[PDB]
Amino acid sequence: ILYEQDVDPKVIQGLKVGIIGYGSQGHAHALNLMDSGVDVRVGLREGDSDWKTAEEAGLKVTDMDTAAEEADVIMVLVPDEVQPKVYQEHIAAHLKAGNTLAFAHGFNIHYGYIVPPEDVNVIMCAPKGPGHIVRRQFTEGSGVPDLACVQQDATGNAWDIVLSYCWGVGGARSGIIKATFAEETEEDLFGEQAVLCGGLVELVKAGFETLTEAGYPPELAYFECYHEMKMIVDLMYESGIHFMNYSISNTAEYGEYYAGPKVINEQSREAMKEILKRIQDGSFAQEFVDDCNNGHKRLLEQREAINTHPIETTGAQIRSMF
Amino acid sequence: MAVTILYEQDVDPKVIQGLKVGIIGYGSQGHAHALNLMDSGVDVRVGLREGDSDWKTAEEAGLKVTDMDTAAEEADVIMVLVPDEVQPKVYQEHIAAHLKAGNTLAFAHGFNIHYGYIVPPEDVNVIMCAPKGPGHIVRRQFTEGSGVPDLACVQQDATGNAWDIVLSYCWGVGGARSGIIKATFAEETEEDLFGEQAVLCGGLVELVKAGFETLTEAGYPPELAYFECYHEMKMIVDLMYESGIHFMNYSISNTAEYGEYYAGPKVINEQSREAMKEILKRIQDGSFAQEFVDDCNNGHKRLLEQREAINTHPIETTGAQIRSMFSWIKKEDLE
Ligand SMILES: NC(=O)c1ccc[n+]([C@@H]2O[C@H](COP(=O)([O-])OP(=O)(O)OC[C@H]3O[C@@H](n4cnc5c(N)ncnc54)[C@H](O)[C@@H]3O)[C@@H](O)[C@H]2O)c1
Ligand SMILES: NC(=O)c1ccc[n+]([C@@H]2O[C@H](COP(=O)([O-])OP(=O)(O)OC[C@H]3O[C@@H](n4cnc5c(N)ncnc54)[C@H](O)[C@@H]3O)[C@@H](O)[C@H]2O)c1
Ligand SMILES: CC(C)N(O)C(=O)C(=O)O
Ligand SMILES: CC(C)N(O)C(=O)C(=O)O
Ligand SMILES: [Mg+2]
Ligand SMILES: [Mg+2]
Ligand SMILES: [Mg+2]
Ligand SMILES: [Mg+2]
Ligand SMILES: [Mg+2]
Ligand SMILES: [Mg+2]
Ligand SMILES: [Mg+2]
Ligand SMILES: [Mg+2]
Ligand SMILES: [Mg+2]
Ligand SMILES: [Mg+2]
């Protein structure tokens, strides 16, 4: 693992970076980069509501073609499924020999949806964390960790560039791991599906539903299953499972060892393997891309089911009172 | 309603401020109830065994510390914060004789009263202030001007103001800032046991662990499996806690959000769901309680064999190495 002493800030401080997109990653990358003394511009479409926001934040904003053309390093921070079209229409023609094409997820390059020219660097700085937090931890004096990867080293100093960039975005604070595009792609898809988003949300929803279905009030279930999760994860994050388990009661600790493997069971472990299998062999990526080409249809249905769930409406009420 | 969440305007701070509180024990909950109540202007003493090494810790925090018998003797409100399993003995040997007519006996969880392991006398209030969080964070959030939510319960209203006392107690430990719910001792016992089992401790920890292991077992370095499955979890949960799942899902990429919907029902599957209902049955019928008490009477045999194992697991040794390198941990160490 690499830290501040292992990277050279001046490298990215001397390059012009163009952030394409201003969504979850884009704003954090853009703002952290500017705060770090980097010359940044954000490349957006005409009619994008965030144009003014990015501007009020104190950034130069221009269209995508101009940002691409002006930039030494061009970081694609738009949804993975729209990167091939966006690359070809607004990026590709602005790439000069010696330029760096950069990503925060190796998905497109790794599965072959985008094949950059042979005469540019192709790197990734993948923060292991949601963009709002990539930004917040950076402003708090901490930083989200990154994988640094180099798929094509056209200039011979792509490593110094990807590592100075991680420094730019807070990575050296908590740690940078050198990885390949294959490795980031695979571990990232797995984490968000198995544990961080799929596993977690559905675990909380399942326990909330078990209680409400058994006649406990939804308000009670939200405090127990959902609100309190933050506090438990906080202790682990700072001091480990051994500290958290010490904090809780021996009743709760016993209950953990006894109930954990019934809830996260041998089938859930096989599911995790199968999830990774489908990541590895490209069939999940094909499924997602298909759904995207079908107008996010399955994504939108499932979004509406979660958004209208009692855990979400009850939670919205309770939090409005804090 | 069903239910009415209550806040600072529903409670009267002066009530608990007018009573002497004896906190018996100084562990997770102990230190948090004791310090938040002292900060809220309450007359607090900590009750500990003679020669306990936490006595200096409590005294270092500026609290009055004395032996348990004296604490219980002096107190109007006797709050029991030692391990659930030792409560019947600690109570018999050191609390009961000190309870006067019109005293209040208080718990932070309903295990002992609900299941019958402790039968209190009919001349005292029997109440509960159960924070829905860990003791270190009941404390932290309070100092941050927030407060962990509380369940307020009364098994016995001896004096006719037991409710006023339990609600005021909740204010004193920060429950008013986020929400107080009135519940029965039964209700809290059952939901609490269920949360920590299914979701907050068993769920979560096995989930993170199985996540980490899946990756290591497929060949990814344990450092990366830690950043991915463990460290990042605090970030996602913070977004949910602040703003809802809808916002967390907004913050994450369409790639991740599609994967969430696709992978969720797979990892947290129909067997996971059956498991939770059986877990809830064993809680409601008292079997789970009898199993836990049996294990404590039997050398904490299962507890300690699992504790050893997860505490020395690679997720823990690797996480401890990784966290030791954080610039904010080194910054804080310097302090
Ligand atoms: N925090 C996360 O969401 C997260 C974390 C790590 C890596 N990543 C990776 O970062 C990259 C971006 O993810 P995100 O979730 O920050 O994106 P997002 O969904 O937040 O992207 C929104 C931004 O992209 C723009 N955009 C959308 N469609 C467009 C189009 N057709 N043309 C031009 N601009 C368009 C929007 O206007 C907006 O500025 C992805 O490769 C993702 O895998 C995301
Ligand atoms: N976060 C939590 O831990 C939490 C949350 C909600 C409710 N509760 C409830 O609060 C109560 C206490 O839980 P905890 O986890 O804070 O306890 P703990 O396990 O942190 O308690 C340890 C303390 O109890 C004392 N102690 C242990 N055995 C003793 C004995 N035989 N005689 C006298 N003192 C003894 C210790 O010396 C120490 O002060 C329980 O009823 C629990 O269910 C705890
Ligand atoms: C935000 C998080 C789940 N994550 O790490 C991602 O990589 C993502 O959103 O795709
Ligand atoms: C999860 C834990 C802090 N909790 O809320 C408890 O009820 C407990 O420790 O017994
Ligand atoms: Mg990720
Ligand atoms: Mg991702
Ligand atoms: Mg404890
Ligand atoms: Mg414990
Ligand atoms: Mg305690
Ligand atoms: Mg007394
Ligand atoms: Mg609890
Ligand atoms: Mg409990
Ligand atoms: Mg997003
Ligand atoms: Mg999304």
Q: Read out DSSP for B299-316?
A: TTHHHHHHHHHHHTSHHH
Resolution, Å (one decimal):
1.8
The vertex-B327 CA angle with B223 and A192, nearest 5°, equals 40
Alpha helices per DSSP H over chain B: 13-17, 28-39, 54-60, 68-74, 87-94, 111-114, 135-143, 162-172, 185-194, 202-217, 222-226, 233-243, 245-251, 254-267, 270-284, 287-297, 301-311, 314-324, 327-334
> Is A113 exposed, middle or buried (CB count within 10 Å of its CB: 0-12, 13-18, 19+)?
middle
Spatial distance between the Cα atoms of B37 and B75, rounded to a whole number of angstroms: 14
Chain A closest-CA separation from residue B61 CA (Å): 18
Backbone torsions φ then ψ of B85, nearest 5 degrees: -70, -25
Alpha helices per DSSP H over A113-191: 131-140, 158-168, 181-190
Q: Both tokens of residue B90?
A: 């600690």
Contact in structure between A275 and B263 (CB atoms under 8 Å): yes
Q: Both tokens of residue B239?
A: 């977004």
The vertex-A193 CA angle with A188 and A199, nearest 5°, equals 130
- Residues flanking ion ligand 11, Cβ below 5 Å: B 192
Contact in structure between B151 and B183 (CB atoms under 8 Å): yes
Helix, coil or strand: residue B178? coil
Instruction: Kindly state the helix (H) or strand (E) to which residue A264 belongs, with its residue range.
Output: none
Helix, coil or strand: residue A67? helix
Spatial distance between the Cα atoms of B127 and A118, rounded to a whole number of angstroms: 73
Give the residue carrying structure tokens 């201003």: A22
Q: Ligand 1 pocket: which of A46, A53, A77 to mutate (most atoms <8 Å of CB)?
A: A77
Q: Give exposure, B293-319, as e/b (b: 16+ Cβ within 10 Å).
A: bebbeeebebbeebbeebeebebbebb
Atom of ligand 4 nearest to the CA of B201: 1
Contact in structure between B212 and B229 (CB atoms under 8 Å): yes
Contact in structure between A158 and A100 (CB atoms under 8 Å): yes
Q: Which of B109, B194, B117 is nearest to B153 (CA)?
A: B109
Characterise B24 by phi-psi region: left (phi > 0), alpha (psi -120 to 50), beta (else).
beta
Whether A249 lines ligand 4, by a CB cut-off of 6 Å, is yes
Spatial distance between the Cα atoms of B331 and B335, rounded to a whole number of angstroms: 7
The fold adopted by the segment(s) B1-183 is Rossmann fold (3.40.50)
For the stretch B321-324, contacts whose Cβ atoms lie closer than 8 Å and that sit 24 or more positions apart, written own/partner, are: B322/A1, B322/A175, B322/B223, B322/B226, B322/B227, B322/B231, B323/A238, B323/A239, B323/A240
Residues in chain A: 322
Name residue A77's amino acid. L
Residue spans in chain A of domains classed CATH 6.10.240.10: 180-322
Residue spans in chain B of domains classed CATH 6.10.240.10: 184-335
Are A202 and B268 a contacting pair at CB < 8 A? yes
Backbone torsions φ then ψ of B147, nearest 5 degrees: 175, 135
User: Active-site residue numbers of A?
Assistant: 105
Whether B150 lines ligand 4, by a CB cut-off of 6 Å, is no
Whether B314 lines ligand 4, by a CB cut-off of 6 Å, is no
Backbone torsions φ then ψ of B155, nearest 5 degrees: -80, -35
Are B237 and A200 a contacting pair at CB < 8 A? yes
CA A138 – ligand 6 centroid, Å:
19
The fold adopted by the segment(s) B184-335 is ProC C-terminal domain-like fold (6.10.240)
Could you tell me the sign of the dihedral formed by the alpha carbons of B114, B120, B124, B129, in that order? Answer: negative
Name residue B49's amino acid. R
Give A298's Cβ-side CA count (13 Å radius): 15
Q: Give exposure, B207-230, as e/b (b: 16+ Cβ within 10 Å).
A: bbbbbbbbbbebebbbbbbbbbbb
Could you tell me the sign of the dihedral formed by the alpha carbons of A23, A27, A30, A32, in that order? Answer: negative
Could you tell me the sign of the dihedral formed by the alpha carbons of B106, B112, B115, B119, in that order? Answer: negative
Q: Both tokens of residue B285?
A: 């019928």
Name residue A230's amino acid. K
Spatial distance between the Cα atoms of B169 and A196, rounded to a whole number of angstroms: 36
| Residues within a 6 A CB radius of ligand 3 | A 130, 188, 192, 196-197; B 232, 236, 252-253, 255-256
Backbone torsions φ then ψ of A207, nearest 5 degrees: -70, -35
Are A322 and B249 a contacting pair at CB < 8 A? no
Three-state secondary structure of B191-234: HHHHHHHHHHHHHHHHHHHHHHHHHHHCCCCHHHHHHHHHHCHH
Spatial distance between the Cα atoms of A250 and B299, rounded to a whole number of angstroms: 13
Give the contacts of A56 (CB within 8 A, at least 6 positions apart). none
Contact in structure between B55 and B80 (CB atoms under 8 Å): no
Spatial distance between the Cα atoms of B202 and A259, rounded to a whole number of angstroms: 5
Spatial distance between the Cα atoms of B191 and A216, rounded to a whole number of angstroms: 8
Strands (E), chain A: 16-20, 39-43, 60-62, 73-76, 100-103, 121-127, 146-152, 176-178
Give B117's Cβ-side CA count (13 Å radius): 19
Chain B closest-CA separation from residue A286 CA (Å): 11
Helix, coil or strand: residue A105? coil
Please tell me the CATH code under which domain A180-322 is placed.
6.10.240.10
The fold adopted by the segment(s) A1-179 is Rossmann fold (3.40.50)
Contact in structure between B87 and B118 (CB atoms under 8 Å): yes
Contact in structure between B234 and A233 (CB atoms under 8 Å): yes
Q: Both tokens of residue B177?
A: 């800032």
Give the contacts of A197 (CB within 8 A, at least 6 positions apart). B236, B248, B249, B252, B256, B257, B259, B260, B263, B264
Q: Which of B188, B195, B149, B200 is nearest to B171 (CA)?
A: B149
| Count of C-beta atoms within a 10 Å radius of residue B36 | 24
| Count of C-beta atoms within a 10 Å radius of residue B250 | 16
Spatial distance between the Cα atoms of B263 and A320, rounded to a whole number of angstroms: 30
Q: Both tokens of residue A259?
A: 């109930």
DSSP at B294: H
Name residue A113's amino acid. Y
Give the residue carrying structure tokens 């610039």: B327
Residue spans in chain A of domains classed CATH 3.40.50.720: 1-179
| DSSP string computed for B253-265 | -HHHHHHHHHHHH
Q: Both tokens of residue B176?
A: 């008013």
Q: Both tokens of residue A58?
A: 């104190």
- Distances, alpha carbon A298 to alpha carbons A108, A113, A192, A278, B259, in Å: 21, 21, 18, 18, 11
Contact in structure between A182 and A149 (CB atoms under 8 Å): no
Q: Which of B335, B287, B292 is nearest to B86 (CA)?
A: B292
Spatial distance between the Cα atoms of A1 and A106, rounded to a whole number of angstroms: 20
Q: Both tokens of residue B40?
A: 């809220």
Spatial distance between the Cα atoms of B31 and A303, rounded to a whole number of angstroms: 42
Contact in structure between B109 and B138 (CB atoms under 8 Å): no
Strand order in the sheet with A39-43: A60-62, A39-43, A16-20, A73-76, A100-103, A121-127, A146-152, A176-178
| Chain A residues close to B282, C-beta within 8 Å | none
Q: Both tokens of residue B130?
A: 């159960």
Q: At how many degrees (to 10) do helices A250-263 and B270-284 cross?
A: 150
Q: At how many degrees (to 10) do helices B301-311 and B287-297 cross?
A: 80
Whether A252 lines ligand 4, by a CB cut-off of 6 Å, is yes
